[PDB]
Paper text:
TRAAK (TWIK-related arachidonic acid activated K+ channel) is a mechanosensitive ion channel from the two-pore domain K+-selective (K2P) channel family. TRAAK is gated open by force directly through the lipid bilayer. Activation of TRAAK involves protein conformational changes that prevent membrane lipids from entering the conduction pathway and blocking K+ passage. TRAAK contributes to the ‘leak’ K+ current in mammalian nerve fiber conduction by hyperpolarizing the resting membrane potential, thereby increasing Na+ channel availability for action potential propagation.
Monoclonal antibodies were therefore raised in Armenian hamsters (C. migratorius) against purified M. musculus TRAAK. To further validate and characterize the nature of the antibody-channel interaction, we determined the X-ray crystal structure of antibody Fab fragments in complex with mouse TRAAK to 2.8 Å resolution. The structure was solved by molecular replacement using Fab and channel search models and refined to a final Rwork = 0.25 and Rfree = 0.29. The structure consists of one channel with two bound Fabs on opposite sides of the channel extracellular helical cap in the asymmetric unit. Consistent with a strong interaction, the Fabs bind to large epitopes (1003 Å2 average buried surface area) with high shape complementarity. Most of the twenty epitope-forming residues are poorly conserved among K2P channels, offering a molecular explanation for the high specificity of the antibody for TRAAK among all mouse K2Ps. TRAAK heterodimers, if present in vivo, are not expected to interact strongly with the antibody as the recognized epitope includes TRAAK-specific residues contributed by each protomer. Antibody 1B10 has no functional effect on mouse TRAAK currents. In this study we show that the mechanosensitive TRAAK channel is localized to nodes of Ranvier in myelinated axons throughout the mammalian nervous system.
Numbering used by the authors:
A (entry chain H): 1 to 136, 146 to 224
B (entry chain I): 1 to 136, 147 to 224
C (entry chain B): 28 to 101, 112 to 247, 256 to 284
D (entry chain A): 28 to 101, 113 to 247, 259 to 284
E (entry chain L), F (entry chain M): 1 to 211
Amino acid sequence: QLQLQESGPGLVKPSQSLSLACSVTGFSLSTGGYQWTWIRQFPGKKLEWMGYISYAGGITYNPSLKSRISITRDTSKNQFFLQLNTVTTEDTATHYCARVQYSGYGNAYFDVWGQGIQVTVSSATTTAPSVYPLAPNTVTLGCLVKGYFPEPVTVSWNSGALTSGVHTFPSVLHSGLYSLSSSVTVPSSTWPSQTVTCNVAHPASSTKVDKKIVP
Amino acid sequence: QLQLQESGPGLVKPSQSLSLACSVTGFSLSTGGYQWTWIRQFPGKKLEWMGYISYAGGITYNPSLKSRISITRDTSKNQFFLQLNTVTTEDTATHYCARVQYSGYGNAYFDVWGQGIQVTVSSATTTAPSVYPLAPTVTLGCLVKGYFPEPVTVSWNSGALTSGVHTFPSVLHSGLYSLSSSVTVPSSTWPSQTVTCNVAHPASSTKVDKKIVP
Amino acid sequence: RSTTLLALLALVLLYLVSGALVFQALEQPHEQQAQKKMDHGRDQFLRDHPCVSQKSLEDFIKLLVEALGGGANPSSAWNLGSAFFFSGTIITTIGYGNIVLHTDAGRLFCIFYALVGIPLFGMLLAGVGDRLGSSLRRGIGHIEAIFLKWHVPPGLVRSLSAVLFLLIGCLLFVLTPTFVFSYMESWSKLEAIYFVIVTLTTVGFGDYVPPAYQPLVWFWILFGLAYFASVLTTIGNWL
Amino acid sequence: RSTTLLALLALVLLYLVSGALVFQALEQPHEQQAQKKMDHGRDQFLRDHPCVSQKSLEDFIKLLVEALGGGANPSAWNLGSAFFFSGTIITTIGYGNIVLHTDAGRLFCIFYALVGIPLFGMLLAGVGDRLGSSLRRGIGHIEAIFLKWHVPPGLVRSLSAVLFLLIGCLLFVLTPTFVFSYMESWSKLEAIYFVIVTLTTVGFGDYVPQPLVWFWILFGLAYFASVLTTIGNWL
Amino acid sequence: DIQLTQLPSFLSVSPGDKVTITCKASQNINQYLHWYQQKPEEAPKLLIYGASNLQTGIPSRFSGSGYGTDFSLTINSLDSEDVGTYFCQQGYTPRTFGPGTKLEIKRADAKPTVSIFPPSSEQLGTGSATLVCFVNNFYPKDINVKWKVDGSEKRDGVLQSVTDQDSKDSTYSLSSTLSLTKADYERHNLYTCEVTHKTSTAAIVKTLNRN
Amino acid sequence: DIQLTQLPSFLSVSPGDKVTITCKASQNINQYLHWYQQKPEEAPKLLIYGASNLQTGIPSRFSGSGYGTDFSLTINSLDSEDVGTYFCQQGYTPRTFGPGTKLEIKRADAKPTVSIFPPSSEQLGTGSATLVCFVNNFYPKDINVKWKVDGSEKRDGVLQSVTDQDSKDSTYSLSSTLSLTKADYERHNLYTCEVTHKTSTAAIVKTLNRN
Ligand SMILES: [K+]
Ligand SMILES: [K+]
Ligand SMILES: [K+]
Ligand SMILES: [K+]
Ligand SMILES: [K+]
Ligand SMILES: [K+]
């Protein structure tokens, strides 16, 4: 089936070029009638369409954001690529990879979307989180992810085996580091007979730590 | 101005590939609205359109002649190229390079044409002509004898003397060609004014002058 | 009357103008909407295909409009039954231009055919407008006895019967057909009306055109026209 | 005379038929012409542009049809066109060169016609009396030369009737045909065909065309009003 | 740029109900407008294309309409899963989006579930001490949480976030933390997480005996 | 393949006159037919495109017409320069041409100009001996040339060609040759180039005294 998945650096320094890449599987870049696009969502969840490239390799750009973008593609690998030059703190947003279709030529609607990649624009260094367990009708446990930069981290309980009754909380900023936590809830019988491990991932410092919960 | 000029070998051996090239000056291959084409004229002066290439590099072929032709181009040099594989004596003809225009999309008409290049398909060797003068208002000539393949070209003082020249069709004697030319000038003018027939046979790289002397 | 005719011309010229301003005001914004769609679509196609050039594509379009106008399609148009109908459009001076004469021959013949045909029709319509004249006169004539008896003066009956000459003819020749076509060719009532009136005034844009239903229309035209010949002349006096 | 009118109808019906057989015979051979052009043009464009795909281009066309149906042209409702359009209505020529898309416009178009036509019909009847008495007093001068050259005053009414036409004809048919043929780069045949189609108020709109033309129409129509009636008698 | 404003900004509605959102365009867009639903921590999904056409694999309870400037998206019978922010976007270049329109789903009030946690040994190692308090699965959104050291309110090094209305059960959750030095942790004894909600009359309290 | 039959095959016409050629197509060509004039030792020129449209820089005396299958090209006022073979070609793929239509221009009969030549010294060197006879600028085309050795007709190693009707003066020319061995040349004495044409009543003769 058709899948899109974004790629590249989570952090960019001001007055540099941001560069990302999107990997299409189950479909061809160069197939007639479908174009390809990059869209970003600011903090505050406001969407700006940036640019857009054809199956044939023709380009269209948001004039607001022209003269800094270049979108390119590589038909052989089956990918395409965004650049944006002279980046500032403004351009911090969650960049999205998507396919385009028409309802009559020109009328652009984005039908299939990507995972989403968070790009941050700051001078300060990436910091790995410290991860710490949380143990005290049915039991609750958690993991504290403390002191990480930049956004985000991602938490999973038994690598997506344990889904229901998890609450991963928004990040909170304490003076230039982030922190959040997650909150798995399970039947109080289940634990501690069944192993429960929060698999944490911070990609911008290449940190990927498990923690089991012990009384 | 726009000019087209064909290029390549005058002779081709059977079951080989004919390859020619056309050089455009005063205009761009890759300019929108004009396409480019190769057309050939048989002995007996019957024309067959062979193939056809766009400004954008899209190709259309005479299906009669498909599966042997490939037309290509080189935008940088500003040329384009014909190939034709497994050539036979059938394919002996005068190949022409031309630009294409439309009278509404599709309706193909060839507006500007090339010089013309004579391609022969034969086993026999190129032979240089022997050139010999002819001296008896006065008339003189040059006899171009025993040349292969077509053509030769004759000029009198390299195109200074145009009027009153008669270059005659080739005649075939048992596997060689021969023709002659027939300059006519005022009988006063000669022999005070030099008269020289500049002969050219390209397929043997022969280019001989002959002056006329009593 | 040469002062009065210059006064008319000026009225006509102000009428044409006052018209054109209304038509423009009604249409231009929707045309403009339509043209924004196209203009945008064209540009995207060029941007989307870099190997295509504007001056190449611009030609292609010119073909399509010409071909679509000629009647190509992304059921023969010159069968006998359509040809008749076409022939009809000429003498009636309605001239839909629903189909078009390609050959010169046909154009040439079209000339002579018109010059003869029209007046031949003009005669027939004048004849039908006398007999349809004496038809409607004898039609109301029996029921005129009941009108006069129910407390109506002889000056007033001439306006009531004049209205009913129309309202009955109208009913038959306008109201009825509008349903018919609206139903048949699945147009709106508005469209039916618009078509109906355009047809009968012998304007025949050809914006709109159409087993018992096939011949019925040819008849309907002839009698409707006769009816409307009179409706126009009455307005000529009214003016 | 109710027997004679049924006799006419039958003549008309045989005429229509005899027509349709001529039109068919001339045209039917070029029905599929239009579609061959398109189909061929489409394919060349695909062959000519390899970066274009069939199912991409196929969409674009669907737009064109929709846009042309919507009434765009690769301004049609400016003032200058609108006037001309307004003109086509009252004159009952109705090219349908441009068409009313909106309902509003259709509705207004109705009332505008009903008033406009008879208003025009009056004006044309007025011009056809004055242009009538204009040409009568014009050729009235040349009637004096006809009488002197062995011609009675009963025969001069046919010679001047011919010259009413041949002069009007010259001005209102022959002259314009050159004009348009030149101007809009049509053939003479086409010019004629257009000229006559226009003046008989048929107005296919196969052919259409600066202010001098608007004038020419009015006087030409007056001229042709008479030309038709003369044929009605002639028959 | 062609400007899309969208109303209303916020609203909450009960499941089973019908709901209708507006997108208003600055120019005439002639039916080239599309509608998306974004759930939290997800990319948008395509609901409606070409103003009115329903995207495949999306239930018929969604339906859109409009032409020109003024469009509207209607949901019949809200399921609980229909929570999210909604956007409209226009087809003409540059392609612009709506500002967003948040749709909360109302439900029967639900009672929170407070559980309190100490600082890990590992953390304590680092010379810091942070305590965590999860208040999960309640309604309405509105709630207050307080920390208490030795029965005395504390608001220094308290930080909390709160999840968006869950898709399944349309509840909220909170996580308040209390960040201290190892030294200041050890100094005091008893740590208390005090929660005020509409559901219970008195405050729901869990406590930590450090000793 | 669409077949283009073009009639007439040949014709000749006096200058000032008007001329009309036919091209007939095997299918309906919808006015997509073009006309070319080729002169000798030259590539074709475009006269008429799109059946009736006159190519720029070609005089108005040329004009074409037709539609569908049957077309026709008309030249109003023949100049001497209008000589050549004419072709029609159609627009649809594969694009095919006409078979050709040769147009001779008639004129007042003109008298040939015979000049005879010996074999060159250089040639004689090689051991061969070929004699040449130019009969230039005559009309009509029809003509006969004979060789005579010692007053006795010779047709062994005689070869001739003839030019196409000149553009300028619409005349023809001929070149007959006589090829011999040096030995067979030396054996005989007097060599004679005898020309039969409409213009002169007796045969136009030049002779070569070898001795
Ligand atoms: K039309
Ligand atoms: K009409
Ligand atoms: K019409
Ligand atoms: K009319
Ligand atoms: K009338
Ligand atoms: K009409």
